[PDB]
Amino acid sequence: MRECISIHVGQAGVQIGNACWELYCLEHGIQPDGQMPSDKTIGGGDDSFNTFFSETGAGKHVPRAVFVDLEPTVIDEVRTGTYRQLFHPEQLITGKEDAANNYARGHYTIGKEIIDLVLDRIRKLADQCTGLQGFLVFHSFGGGTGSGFTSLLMERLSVDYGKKSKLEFSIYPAPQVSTAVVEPYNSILTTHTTLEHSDCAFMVDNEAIYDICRRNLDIERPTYTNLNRLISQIVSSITASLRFDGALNVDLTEFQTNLVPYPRIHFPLATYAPVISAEKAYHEQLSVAEITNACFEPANQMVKCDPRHGKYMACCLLYRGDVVPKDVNAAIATIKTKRSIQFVDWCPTGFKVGINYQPPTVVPGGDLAKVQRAVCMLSNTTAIAEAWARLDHKFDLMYAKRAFVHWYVGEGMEEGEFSEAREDMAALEKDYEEVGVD
Template sequence: MKSLASLTCAVLAFISLQADSAVAAPTNGTHPGCCKNPSIRYEWRQLSLEQRLDYIRSVKCLMALPSEGNDLWPGAKSRYDDFQGMHIYMTQKVHFNGPFLPWHRWMLYLYESELRDKCAYKGTLPYWDVSLDNTAEGFLNSPIFDNVYGVGGDGPYIEDVSNKTEFPVQKPITIPERSGCVQEGPFANTTVPMGLGYSLESTPHCLRRDFSLPIITAALSDEVIDRTIAAASFSELNVHIQGYSMQVSGMTLHAGMHLGIGGAVGDCADMYSSPGDPVFYFVHGALDKIWNDWQRRDWPARKTDIGGPDVMYGYPFNFFGDVAYENITLEYPLSFPNFGGDMLVADMMDIHGGPFCYDSVTIISLDLFLAQSTPDLVYSYHIILHLHLGQAGTQLGNSAWELYVDLLRPIFYLLEHGLGPDGRPDPNAKDVVDGGSYETFFTETSNGKYVPRSLFVDLDPSPIDEIRTGGYRQLFHPELLISGKEDAANNYARGHYTIGKEMVDNVIDRVRRVADNCHSLQGFLIFHSFGGGTGSGFGALLLERLSTEYGKKSKLEFAVYPAPRVSTAVVEPYNAVLSTHSTIENSDCTFLVDNEAVYDICRRNLDIPRPSYDHLNRLIAQVVSSITSSLRFDGALNVDLNEFQTNLVPYPRIHYPLISYAPVISASKSSHESFKVQELTFQCFEPNNQMVVCDPRNGKYMAVALLYRGDVVPRDCNAAIAALKAKASFNLVEWCPTGFKLGINYQKPMAVPVAASDGGLASVDRSVSMLSNTTAIAEAWSRLDHKFDLMYSKRAFVHWYVGEGMEEGEFSEAREDLAALEKDYEEVAADSFEADEGDIEY
């Protein structure tokens, strides 16, 4: 008999859909150290689309390998079929009895090992959190049954068996030819070699499914799941999982999943041959996860809690009359013919050592997560939701929440708030924690974890997949990482009228669910680009919907604007003009950034010869953090979110402030520079420090917000402003004599601890971000309009937009609106206070 001590320690762990942190891996198990570096067994939704395809590829690979069985199951054709053959052969010894859960736990381990060893599968065996799909709508839309990134869906409808008192046992001969065959997805038209029933000979038939939604909603309800996990003993748990009777009313989790999928004719519904359907392994992954969670509730007592009859249909499964049985013990043998011989039940029990060293955490849906989060009891908190749209918005979001430090990659907002990468307070950063208002950007859960109030959305799955599979996937709630299946192809119309339109209702629903959980929601920060398809088209569509549903809430944008000479797409001018036209009435304030200006700052100030997007995004993240620091930390003159638009936007359409930041200096130069408040203030007004390519000296300032951080006092700020006003190069419009809004926050800027060779910003005691509404920004609009005119005069690329349902007249309408915007800035710059006193009306 094989001992686990001789087996390779294949560590499996489960991760939460809450993106909760993994608990510290225990080292007190049978095999100390086995859990030090646990791999993770993911719920299907947690896998990236590439990982899902890799799993599907590996399963099909196993289906293509020759069988290694013998005369026990002669009908098997492939190595995949060997598992079905073993299951058919052993069914009567491992169902409706005590060995059911231990035996299937080892079968899952064997199956995963084969995928990895024979088919180069890179991941671990995924499981299914059925609590997320136990409604009719949820089940039908489950990603498990996706036709591209899942195992495919239902066969043609046959029969609703929910009204039957007993589930019929059907033989292949009674099933109409090809009725219920799965005809879509990666396993379409798959031939199952054995079954239905106890048939180990060759009985080839198509893979069948026959979804029965009434069984799903009854047998897999939240009440059934809660009752199961609350079982007082293993024997009770075993009954709750396997069922109370053979009638529909007595079905629970095991039968509910199998029969809900297989229905009247499907392979999954057959107790013997169900492994012929690849969904079998999701079903039993879910059951094993529940057993694992149950064991953890009272460990180590439940390491030895076992029981149940040693024969099929022994009490309490005596559905057909009493049969003689004995209760199993830890020494009960489990057989796996042709897969390595017998094991013991005891070998299946240790979840803190050996192959089943799970690091399991609570599975939780978004609704339950929000329901269990700590209420925002102090209503004065400025609750802000972050919306990151498209590739640019997602990458900006990554840099706002996460800054790279070698392999550790700490979270920037987390760093400032003294939180660890799993969203839990760092005990070594208590001073920082006590000084910050978590509730502005984070939701606190009942177990002391902080989850960002943010949604990441992209029509292209790749940028979101980077988050799903990144080092901080445990931080963000996975239901707030929303991706499509095809990108907008740099086409505003695809993002706004076709692909984006199909997705916007789902995004708004997620926004609504998160917003409804905020007692004092103040507004939204929206990160996107004007030049991309998703950022421009979908961003405009989402802003329209937000304005309708949250008209009184602030909506501030951080937008990547097309640069003069650096472009990522030929049609950027079209997208930017159309997006600006669509959002101008729906956004309260838009902070513009162009890549060329930030490239130049990185090259000139940080000595980075060829800056990457990481360098750019880190610098922009410093600005974002500075702008929002007054919402999160204490200071002498804190700035509320509403104050930005109140003080920077003199007219609704003139809401595009420039951004600059100081000091931008590398660590190697910091010891040679002075960082006095006045010098930092002057730096912000230098054209070379502006984050949009334009020269403020060619225009007039309408309003300026100076946001200081760190070791700064109001007296120094006032002195700096007085010196600035005395400079001849500073032009302020005549009709705004004050012109300045000050913000002072005591939280000093956090250093980004990267290697000096990587162009990291220096650690400084103070910094300033400047937001300025200046008429010089009209240069950028004029430049954009000129590029638009060059292309549109030849109607170049217009057919791609019209082909997505957009009317060509929208181009002319948008261009006229931008011309009017240029005129607005011109008039504002020309206006002067010339009215006679007698003409003034009050």
């Protein structure tokens, strides 16, 4: 058994982190007070769920997580929320004034003053691990903390934990749930300084979660709560292999091996199905072929793009529920003859498949309907570069006028870092084009 430490940075990371640990507890049968009746080894054990939960002598199962925000209002909901008993106070870290949606403010001004404290707390969790695998870092692209302080933490994690893997869960900015005009700046600044430090990053475009919530869940105007419960479902699908018995993606090193042959192109596209509304009269349960075919519909993708016009470098099918390998291969054969799946020549044209019999758990009183079987497809497509292109375009519009740049320079950042970060994105876009275009 090897431990994974989760780090939640900023409002998006903290609220999403909260929705994930709520789901993990219902999945592993952990009560809010931390007790777990099914765990017969009291105060210890090396079970699969122990990669995410430590145990006290009193039988409390404590998440291996740290919550960091530069302002305290979001983490206070955790301190007084339903699962206030799970985390001890040292795990929840808050400052007094945030980064004001200003990457430079969260990275330089405020980051410099709180970085050594965050590391000390992470060190406390690491000292509980007999074999730490790495870190899972949740954060937003647009926030000043999510962008600015995360990239600083990622730099220091590579220094203090050189041989440890690092996976990101990054929230891509979407205007329908964002009030920050400068998020394109923050997104590119943090991608530039984080690129060489992240081994595998799962981008979630808020625009996609928003539309899934309106189209499939009949939510007229979704909230962060509706978004996070759906995002945590996908996150659970992606991290289940680390928390349950199995042989696919059993350690963080395996995520890179099975999803990232090229180190810089480490942004797999996530596709999830099915999302059924709980308020529905009653749904006809979809088969393995129907949910698997849905993984190739852009409307269930975490980032809106067209994989028909890219090239695949890897593909993982993660099933949860009543699924047997026979039905998977039968659905895949049907899809290869009907879909446009173009692989790169220097990679095999195959699918790694993972099946966990336990169907997806749904938070009581939530929006998602209980389904008998679901799938999350992780494919590394060049088509996800469309998201970088959109982002880069908005960046160029504002930077050509130097709009808002004074706020960043006023916090000690040099204007050159803007173009240095932009030229890196231009290179990242060139690599995608050299890999998936003829």
